[PDB]
Amino acid sequence: APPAVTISASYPGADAKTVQDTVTQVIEQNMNGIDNLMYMSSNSDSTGTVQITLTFESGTDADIAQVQVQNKLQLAMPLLPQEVQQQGVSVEKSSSSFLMVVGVINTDGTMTQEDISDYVAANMKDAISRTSGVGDVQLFGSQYAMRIWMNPNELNKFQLTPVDVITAIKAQNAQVAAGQLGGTPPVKGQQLNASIIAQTRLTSTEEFGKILLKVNQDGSRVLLRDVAKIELGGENYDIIAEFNGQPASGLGIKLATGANALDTAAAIRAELAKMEPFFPSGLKIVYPYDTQGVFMTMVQLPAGATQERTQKVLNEVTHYYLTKEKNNVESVFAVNGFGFAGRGQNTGIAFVSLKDWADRPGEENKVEAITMRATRAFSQIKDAMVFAFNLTGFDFELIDQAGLGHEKLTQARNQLLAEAAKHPDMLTSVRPNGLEDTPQFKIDIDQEKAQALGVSINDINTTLGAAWGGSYVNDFIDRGRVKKVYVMSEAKYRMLPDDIGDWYVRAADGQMVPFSAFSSSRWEYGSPRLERYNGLPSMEILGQAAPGKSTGEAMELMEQLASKLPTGVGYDWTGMSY
Amino acid sequence: APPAVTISASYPGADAKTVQDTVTQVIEQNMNGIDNLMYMSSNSDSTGTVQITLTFESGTDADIAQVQVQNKLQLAMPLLPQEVQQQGVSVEKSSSSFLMVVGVINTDGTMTQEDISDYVAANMKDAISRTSGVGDVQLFGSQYAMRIWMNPNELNKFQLTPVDVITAIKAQNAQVAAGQLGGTPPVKGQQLNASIIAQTRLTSTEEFGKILLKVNQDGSRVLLRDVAKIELGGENYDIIAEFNGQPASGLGIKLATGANALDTAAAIRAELAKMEPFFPSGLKIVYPYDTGVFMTMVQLPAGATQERTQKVLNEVTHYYLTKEKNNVESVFAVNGFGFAGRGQNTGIAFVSLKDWADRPGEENKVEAITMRATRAFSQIKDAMVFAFNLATGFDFELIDQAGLGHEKLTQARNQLLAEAAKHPDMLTSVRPNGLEDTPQFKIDIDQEKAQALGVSINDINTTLGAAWGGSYVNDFIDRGRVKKVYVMSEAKYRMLPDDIGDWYVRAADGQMVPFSAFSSSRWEYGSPRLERYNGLPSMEILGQAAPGKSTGEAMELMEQLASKLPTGVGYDWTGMSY
Amino acid sequence: GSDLGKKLLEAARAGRDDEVRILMANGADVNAADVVGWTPLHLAAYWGHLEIVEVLLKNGADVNAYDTLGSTPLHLAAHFGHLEIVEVLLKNGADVNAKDDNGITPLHLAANRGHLEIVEVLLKYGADVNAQDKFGKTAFDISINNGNEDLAEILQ
Numbered sequence A: 001a002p003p004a005v006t007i008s009a010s011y012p013g014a015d016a017k018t019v020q021d022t023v024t025q026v027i028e029q030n031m032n033g034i035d036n037l038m039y040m041s042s043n044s045d046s047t048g049t050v051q052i053t054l055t056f057e058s059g060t061d062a063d064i065a066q067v068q069v070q071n072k073l074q075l076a077m078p079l080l081p082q083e084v085q086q087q088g089v090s091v092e093k094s095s096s097s098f099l100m101v102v103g104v105i106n107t108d109g110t111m112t113q114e115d116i117s118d119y120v121a122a123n124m125k126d127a128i129s130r131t132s133g134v135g136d137v138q139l140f141g142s143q144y145a146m147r148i149w150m151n152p153n154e155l156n157k158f159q160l161t162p163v164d165v166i167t168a169i170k171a172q173n174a175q176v177a178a179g180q181l182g183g184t185p186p187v188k189g190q191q192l193n194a195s196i197i198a199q200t201r202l203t204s205t206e207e208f209g210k211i212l213l214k215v216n217q218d219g220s221r222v223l224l225r226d227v228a229k230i231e232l233g234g235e236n237y238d239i240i241a242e243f244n245g246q247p248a249s250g251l252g253i254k255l256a257t258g259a260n261a262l263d264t265a266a267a268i269r270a271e272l273a274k275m276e277p278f279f280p281s282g283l284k285i286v287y288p289y290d291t292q293g294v295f296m297t298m299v300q301l302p303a304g305a306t307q308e309r310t311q312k313v314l315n316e317v318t319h320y321y322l323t324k325e326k327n328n329v330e331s332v333f334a335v336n337g338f339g340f341a342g343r344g345q346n347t348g349i350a351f352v353s354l355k356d357w358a359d360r361p362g363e364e365n366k367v368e369a370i371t372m373r374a375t376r377a378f379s380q381i382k383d384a385m386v387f388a389f390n391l392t393g394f395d396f397e398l399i400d401q402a403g404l405g406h407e408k409l410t411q412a413r414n415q416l417l418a419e420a421a422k423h424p425d426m427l428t429s430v431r432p433n434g435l436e437d438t439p440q441f442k443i444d445i446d447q448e449k450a451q452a453l454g455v456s457i458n459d460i461n462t463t464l465g466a467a468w469g470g471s472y473v474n475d476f477i478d479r480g481r482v483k484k485v486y487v488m489s490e491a492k493y494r495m496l497p498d499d500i501g502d503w504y505v506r507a508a509d510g511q512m513v514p515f516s517a518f519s520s521s522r523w524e525y526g527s528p529r530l531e532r533y534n535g536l537p538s539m540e541i542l543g544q545a546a547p548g549k550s551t552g553e554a555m556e557l558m559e560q561l562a563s564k565l566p567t568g569v570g571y572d573w574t575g576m577s578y
Numbered sequence B: 001a002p003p004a005v006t007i008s009a010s011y012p013g014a015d016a017k018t019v020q021d022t023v024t025q026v027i028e029q030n031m032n033g034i035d036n037l038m039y040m041s042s043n044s045d046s047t048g049t050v051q052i053t054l055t056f057e058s059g060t061d062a063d064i065a066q067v068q069v070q071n072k073l074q075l076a077m078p079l080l081p082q083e084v085q086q087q088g089v090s091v092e093k094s095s096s097s098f099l100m101v102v103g104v105i106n107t108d109g110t111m112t113q114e115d116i117s118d119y120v121a122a123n124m125k126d127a128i129s130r131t132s133g134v135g136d137v138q139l140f141g142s143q144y145a146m147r148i149w150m151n152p153n154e155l156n157k158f159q160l161t162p163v164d165v166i167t168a169i170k171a172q173n174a175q176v177a178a179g180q181l182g183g184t185p186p187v188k189g190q191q192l193n194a195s196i197i198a199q200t201r202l203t204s205t206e207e208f209g210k211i212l213l214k215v216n217q218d219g220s221r222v223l224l225r226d227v228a229k230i231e232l233g234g235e236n237y238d239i240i241a242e243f244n245g246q247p248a249s250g251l252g253i254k255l256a257t258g259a260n261a262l263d264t265a266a267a268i269r270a271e272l273a274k275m276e277p278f279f280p281s282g283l284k285i286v287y288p289y290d291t292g293v294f295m296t297m298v299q300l301p302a303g304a305t306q307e308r309t310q311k312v313l314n315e316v317t318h319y320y321l322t323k324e325k326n327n328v329e330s331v332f333a334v335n336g337f338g339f340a341g342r343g344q345n346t347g348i349a350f351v352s353l354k355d356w357a358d359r360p361g362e363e364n365k366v367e368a369i370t371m372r373a374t375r376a377f378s379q380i381k382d383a384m385v386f387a388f389n390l391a392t393g394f395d396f397e398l399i400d401q402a403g404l405g406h407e408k409l410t411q412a413r414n415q416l417l418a419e420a421a422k423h424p425d426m427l428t429s430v431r432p433n434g435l436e437d438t439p440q441f442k443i444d445i446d447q448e449k450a451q452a453l454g455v456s457i458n459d460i461n462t463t464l465g466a467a468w469g470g471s472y473v474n475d476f477i478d479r480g481r482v483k484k485v486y487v488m489s490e491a492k493y494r495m496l497p498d499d500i501g502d503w504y505v506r507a508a509d510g511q512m513v514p515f516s517a518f519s520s521s522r523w524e525y526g527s528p529r530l531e532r533y534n535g536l537p538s539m540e541i542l543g544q545a546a547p548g549k550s551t552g553e554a555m556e557l558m559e560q561l562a563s564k565l566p567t568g569v570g571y572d573w574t575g576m577s578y
Numbered sequence C: 001g002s003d004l005g006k007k008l009l010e011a012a013r014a015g016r017d018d019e020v021r022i023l024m025a026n027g028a029d030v031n032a033a034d035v036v037g038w039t040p041l042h043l044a045a046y047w048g049h050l051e052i053v054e055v056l057l058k059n060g061a062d063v064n065a066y067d068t069l070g071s072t073p074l075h076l077a078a079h080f081g082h083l084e085i086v087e088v089l090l091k092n093g094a095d096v097n098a099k100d101d102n103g104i105t106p107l108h109l110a111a112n113r114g115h116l117e118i119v120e121v122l123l124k125y126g127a128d129v130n131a132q133d134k135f136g137k138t139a140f141d142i143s144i145n146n147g148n149e150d151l152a153e154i155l156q
Ligand SMILES: COCCN1CCN(c2nc(SCCc3ccc(OC)c(OC)c3)c(C#N)c3c2COC(C)(C)C3)CC1
Pocket: B097, B098, B101, B139, B140, B141, B239, B240, B241, B248, B249, B250, B252, B288, B289, B293, B332, B334, B337, B350, B351, B352
């Protein structure tokens, strides 16, 4: 297979364009001078995530490819936003499919899904990630951070903002290098040498809750807990898993390019065996997907679908396997928020493990027939693509060659898809691989009104972003382990458009100014996932030859339709069609 | 021996916990996706140093291991404190040992070790690095830094703090781009083009002395020399080295992979011969180790100072140079490191024997020498002093598997050690490899008082850190060579707890506030050296099989004792016992 | 005093009950002090070695020895939640209202760590509930600041 190296980065609270124009384009522009690169593709998403895939000529040494990529990325790192740099950028040389899933459940229902995920993140994932052959490890859930859930009513009552909160956290959750008594070079006759210990990271919600934000003129104290709820909770809330319908987390493990499948899996089990004796009570490992006695089901809903609606679809999938197929299926491990493609609120995946072969006699109880029957049962689910598969027609990129921009490229894409649909004798299921534009809330900050009021634009933008998007402030120590601190609005003050107006910013003169005084807003459409191909804006189109036609005939026709598109729109073949 | 790679970082003025929790953990958490890793071990210490050692399977290519580690570290660089990034975080192959150790001494009594180290850095080290067959070259000491040694009494006199000093150095020891007259794009027909040269880095103590801190309201100037003594000195003062009692620097030189030992040694000696003509007076090269060197370790009690250690090392040198004058050519005494730790209460002497041919009879061989030496030093009071020549023993790690914390892991360790003591039939000399907790000075800043007085936390913490720990401010140019500038208190104002109260910080309203107004302190115990194993808190335990027991039996007993420890304590075997 | 002194400080530190009895019998200064002014009684109180505490007190250890920052063995026992040591020290005459150099009392320290059984014994032995440290703060302020309603109960 051509080896591929993946760069991943994140920007908390960023929309797709923001990610693309501050991160993705910057990396791409700097991926020069790397040997044997066949092509590069990227997605920039409204989850705040970018993935850049660099695919190398067959025969390329994946180690050299990875090192060359990492080194260019290193020279580009100072060009990226500080918020992106501080999340950690990763570079992996991995297969894109899973080798295995390590599930973790709590048999005594002592621990919620969130607890279990933190336990895995904080106690298991690093040692697995260091096991030789392990290319990529996905946590099905999130590590805890310290979560400061801000209340805008209480902030405004005390004439405070998220900026004051972030400032206080950085000042009061600090790890200070303070020197030594009797330090070198010392005076003659010194008797005592001892470290000076000053501020140290906080370790608990109790300690965060008593951060001192201010002292009122009257002498009363405003503590962080007087304007926020303080709790441990995920760095993010996007991925939730279940094992046979019960709360779970786990690790999805991808094989390092060129490593040995069987050796790596055994190294993994051996590492798990070291951890088990120290689990808290109730906690237990399950094995829901070991790579013909397994398969996957993909769930892909339209952009716009929420966590609740993806979950309803996954509940249908899971139910089918635990009822209609309960004689063949041993388990289902289902993940809401991550799928084939990676991360989104509109996607899911179910890993299905079958009973022993010898106990599924009959060709109707073998994987091929089970997957076919499942796809057929799920083919009627509304506004979802749901199918079961183990783990070919064409792979086309439409390309913006002339700075046309997203809206025009979408119109060209639609023109091509309409033309393709008039040739059903030659092309079947010609479709975009990506996502459709969805409504977004465009808010305009009035620079004039802000200046007239003495309200700083940086205080406005921090207030907006930190409250509605979240902001990674600094690190703390949870039960001995370095983890993140995040500030964000408590959920109920960031749900609806009118909530924008309840957030106040402090002017230079000390007055509190509501957001409504200096902003206006409207609905518009934009992209939840912007694609690029060899550094240019792109839209991936999949399809296949119609029955009784060669792939090459299907491709020749696509090329002909492509030659009639608006000026500045090109194309290229990738993946299986390269 | 399995190949190993060591990551080394420095955080000047940082305690062990500060280093561990802002640097070590962050690095360890990023050590994934690295092939062939058998285990990872780290130490974080009170001299602000971390060493992380990654040990690879036998037959791993050490260059490939090194590059994979370095890339993962480099991608985590923005996660580390600035102060650490500015010191450089090195990644080197560490399983190699030395071709040769060159000492550079001065015999006239005219140069300090810092003077000799600067000479070596500026005039010798790079020519030796380019010598045929030479790999890594380690400098013993540093090039000069410009040392600004602050006086808190003079600072407070003029209502200044170290913050003002640091600001003034950045502003007045600066070198910035100022553009051109007549540069492109010009007015057409322009004839004049000339670079604009504005401030240039400072080059001398005199120039640093004239930096203008402020002009008083009566028009008198306060110059940096009115609040500080200014001299060229070392970048740090942790280590004092002597060669036969004379100040010393030198070079530790490794053989490039594939080169010849004998030709490389000869090429080094010939290169040093060329430099001899240019040496200043008294400078001499010595060769304490070149491919019968033994060691004497020195360990003083908790909190013992560099000066007390020096007295012991000086008795050790004197002994060898009088009582073993027929057998000993040199003693290279290093104060501030030993094996098992850095720190003011540790030291080691490297003793180079005269030729075999000049030491007739068994009484003059290494073994008789070291036994007499140990016998004689067993008198020395308030130090442990031991002479030694480098399938017996075992190397065990006790591991915190469940967030127990340092105090609990130490209690578990002590339980295991008390049990191992009860089986002298089977186990002998079961002991910690590391250091015990020692007194430390805990200073708590009072946030309410700081806020009531208008004193900023950042001013407080910079004033404390910069005075007592030192701070690398920026670079200057010494005789054409870029070098570091450090601020730190003059030694006499940073020695004892009472000196804390001589440091003032300036409030927003301009009043000077002593430290004692907003802080309190107490004595407590804590670690001067924290250890981690495979990413978890750890304590290494050494030991051996008793008279005619196998190591296998001894290990089995340790395993069985280890199984009775408190919940959440695990173990592993490492090094020779892996 | 002695080299036995240093040995007694080390033995009390590391909890070595027997070696403490021996060094005692050989005339080790019971009130020997290390460089930060900690006596064997400080060291046994901090590290929770109850029996060493008792043995040292029977041998005339000064119950109110103060370190170079004004802290007494009771401060350390109270801060580190060693209840039985707190009782023993108070029975041997420990000053229940001793203030360190910062004006901090054993009640302030137990209160800040939420060591309620200790708070109770301190109050039983006459701890001044209104004693202020250098910043004006009482054990009650400490309870309000830390959000410990159980401790706020007890101290009214
Ligand atoms: C960062 O320090 C760790 C390096 N260790 C291995 C090399 N080593 C060694 N040092 C010496 S001589 C002392 C060198 C020295 C002088 C000043 C210093 O001050 C800055 C200093 O610190 C680096 C070291 C010798 C010999 N002979 C050997 C080793 C090594 O062992 C031999 C047997 C080869 C002879 C010193 C310790």
